[PDB]
A paper describes a structure:
When the reduced NADH level is elevated, NADH is bound to a Rex protein, causing it to dissociate from the Rex DNA operator. TmRex forms a homodimer, and each monomer was composed of two distinct domains: the N-terminal domain involved in DNA binding and the C-terminal domain involved in NAD binding, which were linked by a flexible loop (residues 78–83).
NADH-bound TmRex crystals were grown by co-crystallization. The structure of the NADH-bound form was determined at 2.45 Å resolution and refined to Rwork and Rfree of 21.53% and 24.73%, respectively. In contrast to the NAD+-bound TmRex, the reduced nicotinamide of NADH was flipped by allowing the carboxamide group to form hydrogen bonds with the main chain atoms of Ile190 O and Ile192 N at the N-terminus of the helix α9. Particularly, the N-terminal domains of each subunit tilted approximately 30° toward each other, resulting in higher proximity between the DNA recognition helices (α3) of the N-terminal domains from 35.7 Å to 29.5 Å. Because the rearranged N-terminal domains were too close to interact with the cognate DNA, the dramatic conformational change of the N-terminal domains by NADH binding allowed TmRex to dissociate from the DNA. The residues were well conserved in the Rex homologues of T. aquaticus, T. thermophilus, B. subtilis, and S. agalactiae, whereas the arginine was replaced by Met18′ in TmRex. The reduced nicotinamide formed hydrogen bonds with the main chain atoms of Ile190 and Ile192 in TmRex, which is consistently found in the Rex homologous structures.
Residue numbers in the entry:
A (entry chain B): 6 to 208
B (entry chain A): 3 to 208
The structure:
């Protein structure tokens, strides 16, 4: 389901962060503190990799990071479009890290004539939203990013579904209802998680 | 407010569970339903939730809204939080105009940018962008508790060091760097959300 995918990505991000610190062996307790999770749950998940995932008395950071990365398919590239050339849409098209990880934005769209024709990023010009459905099907786009206001999120999501999209990354504060998977971005949820750790420490 | 870790761990679990119940339109929940979604004994739920008396009960079950307000109150997170945004670019402007923040009690009382051509602009209705030199003074004078880092990766660790010396209580970071500060830091990374998305896409194809 959704939680096991989030944990697997959590493990991957944490192990990558552990490798940058020079750590080669990590314990389930240390992973518990970094991911805010039970240690027994971590040992239950990582037993999938057997002895290959172990080193010393803890876990082989390098082996787990490599195996999970192959499970997550980090080598594959993905074609993305962004609907909405506002503040969020411009930030996504200018996000240097996304292009490095294989998430290629080949098109960005908007409904405002003042933004159409201009450049959202180097090599990417804003296209009319009326051409979004043909653009998705012509380039075989897999992922669409919804960066339009709330009241147009569901409509854009449905046109992506009709055009053959495979998944949606949604910024708009609406519950998108489609038959493709959806990942919602909610910085308010990240803020709430931050407030919990603030009151625990500051008290 | 001395709350033990085993008790505090369940309150946040209740809190997160009750939050989804409100977004599901649920007004009344039973101890057995809470047991089903929390993987805790129903005898434990009724033991914990009796702390709120009749105020937490509604009909034959529990008042989801009253319990959500009271548990967030005990955890100390229901209060309004004063926020500042460092960086008035694309991310900073979108954060400054985000409606859902104000509804959940995250009020941005100031935004900062080191660009002289940007200083003085509006960015969002009801607020003015300021010079980053006065970030320490603004955080100290207004008691800002959460700082949002929307600066490029090059100046990100320095911004987090200034907020720590100014007395910030937390940091929301967008920049793609490892923030090395003693204050708690929460990082936003849509590539992680994309990795979750692509993994689910591939599994459905298989
Ligand atoms: N998930 C989160 O944490 C946050 C959510 N948001 C949401 O992201 C979305 C956009 O945010 P901003 O960039 O700050 O606002 P914005 O106004 O700068 O961007 C909106 C863009 O979408 C275009 N647009 C409007 N209707 C359209 C349609 N049917 N089709 C194509 N394009 C259309 C507009 O021309 C405009 O350029 C909003 O829904 C906002 O609530 C904003 C900040 C963070
Ligand atoms: N976590 C995620 O998923 C994503 C992260 N980002 C990151 O957010 C940050 C901002 O991105 P954008 O706003 O889209 O680009 P941007 O170029 O529009 O934002 C830069 C702004 O920060 C200002 N600035 C530069 N140095 C500063 C300093 N020392 N102090 C205060 N302000 C300073 C600049 O004057 C400019 O206004 C970047 O680090 C970016 O990598 C961007 C997209 C999504």
């Amino acid at each position: 389901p959704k939680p096991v995918s989030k944990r697997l990505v959590s493990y991957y991000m944490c192990l990558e962060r552990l490798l940058d610190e020079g750590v080669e062996v990590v314990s389930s307790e240390e992973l518990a503190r970094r991911l805010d999770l039970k240690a027994s749950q971590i040992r239950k998940d990582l037993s999938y990799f057997g002895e290959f995932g172990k080193r010393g008395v803890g876990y082989n950071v390098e082996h787990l990071y490599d195996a999970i990365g192959e499970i997550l398919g980090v080598k594959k590239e993905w074609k993305l479009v962004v609907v909405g050339a506002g503040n969020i849409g411009r930030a996504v098209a200018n996000y240097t890290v996304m292009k490095e990880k294989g998430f290629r934005i080949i098109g960005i769209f908007d409904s405002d004539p003042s933004k159409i024709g201009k450049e959202a990023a180097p090599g990417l010009t804003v296209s009319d939203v009326s051409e979004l459905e043909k653009f998705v099907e012509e380039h075989g786009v897999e992922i669409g990013v919804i960066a339009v206001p709330a009241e147009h999120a569901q409509e854009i999501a449905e046109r992506l579904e009709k055009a053959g999209i495979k998944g949606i990354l949604n910024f708009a504060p609406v519950k998108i209802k489609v038959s493709v998977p959806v990942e919602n971005i909610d910085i308010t949820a990240s803020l709430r998680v931050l407030t919990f750790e603030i009151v625990r420490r500051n008290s």
